[PDB]
Design a protein around this nucleic acid. Structure first.
Lengths: 121, 120, 120
RNA sequence: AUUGAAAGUUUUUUUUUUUUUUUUUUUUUUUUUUUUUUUUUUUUUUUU
């Protein structure tokens, strides 16, 4: 469901950022918090899409992650968009806190698969 | 304090390398500002501190401190803002009606209303 | 909606600059930021249109782009004007950062079509 | 056709009152819009 979309988006956004001297994901938690705050303040989905596009164009959001976000957040209700963004934020925070390597986590496309991976080890 | 007759002005400042004076080392930063002169809606509430009449001696020197702060704000004006060292940001209170509301007689109806200049 | 107009004008402004050594937009982001700053500083639509016309006469603005901007801002309130200008600036920034090719966005008239094109 | 039987464990009672997620916390500290460029060259105050 929405959780699978959120997990795929978080995995795409957690890929290592090239030309960065320190190991870190391509995006930052500040970007996700800004996304949520902008959606809450503006209460519009098209404005959120514009924000996502500009963040992608600022060379700080992975183009694949941006494409996934735009694909998910079209013909979608505001409440559904809010829920999806919250799920994305929570999954990203979990992955950051657990320091999950992107190499062994990029191969999962289901939330249940991610849960199994985390539970096993 | 929101503004009414505001105007946003952008100023661009760049640094000068001390060796080979004049070169811009790429530290070109542009900042947004407000116009020099624009009204702001100021409103402040003070409780249990009579100013028009003042307190005799109980927990005093607080009324004096508040009056000193108000006098500095009115005549000189305090410095607030982001730069605050190159002169960016100097607010000032031009005039303000001081309305006193006392609980026993009439709290909704103002008791004494005076201009801030007479208070200080 | 305002966003459709913004997308159309940004598309008109992202046309390649004729007679240029490198493939670059005919209109630069500095011009858009200058438009925003001028509107914020002056806080009126008439001299904003005057500045737009002067820039268009002094190159750097496509004739059709200037015509679309003038038609859009012919009769608009200050808040609506600044909203439209902000939308235009954001759309142009997205197009520039994404390095989207002009030939693939010559037929878009709405914002949803552009979003679909970008997503795909 | 049990020694032999025919009776609702039922009525009745509000889990209610007292309590502000509150006080304190300035998105500021630093950076000269300078820098190389001669308003220059051509022209007889002059004939029947």
């Amino acid at each position: 469901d929405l959780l699978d979309i959120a997990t795929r988006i978080a995995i795409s956004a957690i890929k290592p950022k090239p030309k960065s001297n320190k190991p870190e994901p391509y995006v930052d938690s500040s970007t996700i918090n800004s996304l949520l705050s902008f959606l809450q303040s503006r209460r519009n989905v098209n404005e959120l899409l514009l924000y996502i596009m500009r963040q992608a164009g600022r060379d700080e959001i992975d183009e694949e992650t941006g494409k996934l976000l735009l694909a998910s957040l079209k013909d979608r209700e505001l409440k559904d968009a809010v829920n999806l963004l919250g799920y994305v934020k929570w999954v990203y925070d979990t992955l950051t806190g657990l320091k999950v390597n992107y190499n062994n986590v990029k191969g999962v496309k289901t939330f249940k698969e991610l849960v199994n991976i985390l539970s096993k080890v | 304090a929101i503004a009414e007759k505001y105007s946003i002005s952008q100023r661009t400042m760049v640094a000068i390398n001390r060796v080979f004076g004049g070169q811009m080392p790429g530290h070109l930063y542009t900042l947004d500002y407000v116009d020099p002169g624009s009204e702001f809606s100021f409103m402040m509430m003070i409780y249990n501190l009579n100013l028009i009449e003042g307190e005799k001696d109980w927990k005093a020197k607080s009324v004096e401190a508040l009056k000193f702060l108000l006098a500095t704000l009115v005549r000189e004006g305090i410095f607030v803002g982001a730069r605050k060292s190159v002169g960016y940001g100097l607010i000032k209170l031009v005039d303000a009606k001081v309305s006193l509301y006392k609980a026993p007689d009439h709290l909704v109806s103002p008791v004494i209303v005076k201009k801030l200049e007479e208070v200080i």
